[model samples]
Target: SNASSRWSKDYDVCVCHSEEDLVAAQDLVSYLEGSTASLRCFLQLRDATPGGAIVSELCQALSSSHCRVLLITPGFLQDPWCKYQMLQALTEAPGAEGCTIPLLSGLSRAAYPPELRFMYYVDGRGPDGGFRQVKEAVMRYLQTLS
Candidate 1:
C-alpha cells in the first residue's frame, strides 16, 4: 500500500490505520457518508493501470487530507507499513493541530516511536458504546469543514 492507492482524496477527513483496523476504520467512514469526511487508508488500484505501491503515496494522501485521523492499535505500531503511515501523518501533515485527530482502539498509553505521546485521541471504548466519541467528533468536524 505504498505508491498509488487509486482509492484516493479535499477530503473532509483522511483516516490512516492498519489493515487489521479496517473494521474500525470502516465504521468511522460509514458514519461520515452523508458528511464530507472520507477515510484514506491503504491504496487500492482502481484502474487497470499496473503500478507498485510507492512509499511516497502515504505522504501524498496525508497532504491531500483536510483533517487527518489516526486509529492507533498495537498492530499498527508494530507493522512497518502502518508505522510508516503514522510517520507520514506526523511528518507530512504539520501545523494542523486542529485538523489532526487520533483515536485509540484496543490499546492505551502506548508511545508511537516518533512522538512523546499520542497528542490526544478520542477513545472508541466509551462506556456508552465503542466509537461513539469518534462518531460525534467526525460529525462535528463534518460541519466545520476547513
Candidate 2:
C-alpha cells in the first residue's frame, strides 16, 4: 500500500524547454536530490512563455511547504511570472520555515533578484565544482534547521 500510494501520486519535475536546457535541469535535479535531504521536488518550466499561473501556484505552495532549494536559470529570470514569484519569496525572512534557499544555476550576476543579492548562491556550472558548492550550502542550511 505504501508503494502503491507513492506510485499513485504524481511527482512532476519541472524543467523549462525541450533541448539541452531540459537535460541540464534534469542533471541538476539528480545532483540535488542525491546530495540533499529533499523529500519532494516540484519543477517549474518557463520555456520563454509567461508563467503567471505557475508562479502563483508556486507562491501558494511556498506559503504551505518548506522549499529547501530554488534552482534558477536564465529562463527563470526571463519569465515575468517566475520573477514575480521570486520577488514574493524574497520578502520572506531568511532561514524561515517554508523557504530556505534561492540557488542560482549559474554564476550570472544578472539572474538574482535585487533583494536577494545579500543571500549566498552556488555556482552550478563548473564540472563537479558546482556539486561541492551546493553540498556545502545545503549542509550549512540544514544545520540551521537542526
Candidate 3:
C-alpha cells in the first residue's frame, strides 16, 4: 500500500480553490479525512499564517504537500488568486505525472485550463465518486515514490 512513503509527505494533498468555492473544498477535505485513508490535506483558508505573505504561504504549502488539487470551477477562473496559485503549482513541477489533480466542477471541457490538459482530471460534479477519485489520485501519486 506504500503507506510509509506516502505518510512521509508533509501532506497528501494541497487544495487550491477560490473563496467562492469554499464549500466544495471543505467537502473534499472532509471526505479525505473521514475515510479509512484518513489523508492529510493543506487548505490555505485554514492553514495560512494570518500575517504571512500570500505568495510565500502558497509556495510553502505547495512544496510541503505531495499532490496539488486545483478545484476548478467558474469561481476559480474568475479569481486571480486562484489562477496565480495554479500557475505556481504548475510551474513548480511541470511534466510530473500525478503531481497535480484538477478537480473540475461546473466547468466544461472547453473551459479546462490548456496548461493542465496533459494531466488527467477528476470530475467533481458528483461528490461521492469524485471524493474517492481525489483520494485515489493522492495515493496513486505516493505509490510512484515507493
Candidate 4:
C-alpha cells in the first residue's frame, strides 16, 4: 500500500505509441500478458481521471514505470499528443541505459524523427519477434530499477 501510494509503478514497460499503431501494440501486450506492459493509448485514460487532472492524467503512467518502450512509426510522429509521449519518455528516461527506449518499426536511422535520429533504438522491424526483443531489453533494464 505504501508503495502504491508512493508512485511505485503502473506498469513494467509503458508501450508508448500513436493510435494508428495500437492494433499492433495491443498484440504486443497480449503476447506478453504476464509482463505487465501497458498498451493503453493516451486518449483512453480520459475516464480514469475524475477531474481530468493533467499530472495524474498524464505523467503517472509514465513516471511510475521503470522503463518506456516507444513505438516509433510514421503515424506516431504526426500526432501532437503522441509527440509529447515521445518527449516525456526522453525527458524522463534520458537515454537507452536510462528509462527511454525506441522501437523502430518500418523505418531507418534516416527515418527517425529529426530530434531522435542519433539515439539508439530497438529494431521493431528487425527481429523474429520485434516485441520480444524489445521486451527482453526492458527486462534487462528492469534489473537496474528500484
Output the number of the TM-score-best candidate. Answer: 3
**Which ranking of candidates, highest TM-score first?**
3, 1, 4, 2
lDDT of 3 by residue, 32-75 (tens): 56645546555556565767755535557767776767677676
Every model's TM-score? 0.51, 0.41, 0.55, 0.50
- Order the candidates by lDDT, highest first: 3, 1, 4, 2
Candidate with top lDDT is 3
Q: Provide C-alpha RMSD values for all models, in order.
A: 8.8, 7.9, 6.3, 6.8
Q: 48-126 in candidate 4: lDDT tens per residue?
A: 6556654432256666666666667776677888677666655654344445555666766565654454445455546
- In terms of TM-score, how similar is model 2 to the real structure? 0.41
Q: Which residue pairs of candidate 4 clash?
A: none
For model 3 the TM-score comes to 0.55
Better of 2 and 3 by lDDT: 3
lDDT of 3 at 138: 65
Q: How does each model score on lDDT? A: 0.58, 0.50, 0.63, 0.57
Candidate 1 ranges with C-alpha deviation above 4 Å: 1-9, 35-56, 75-98, 109-130
Residue 96 C-alpha lDDT in model 2? 51
For 58-128, candidate 1 gives per-residue lDDT tens digits of: 45665765665666778667788978877675676556453556566666543534533554534556463
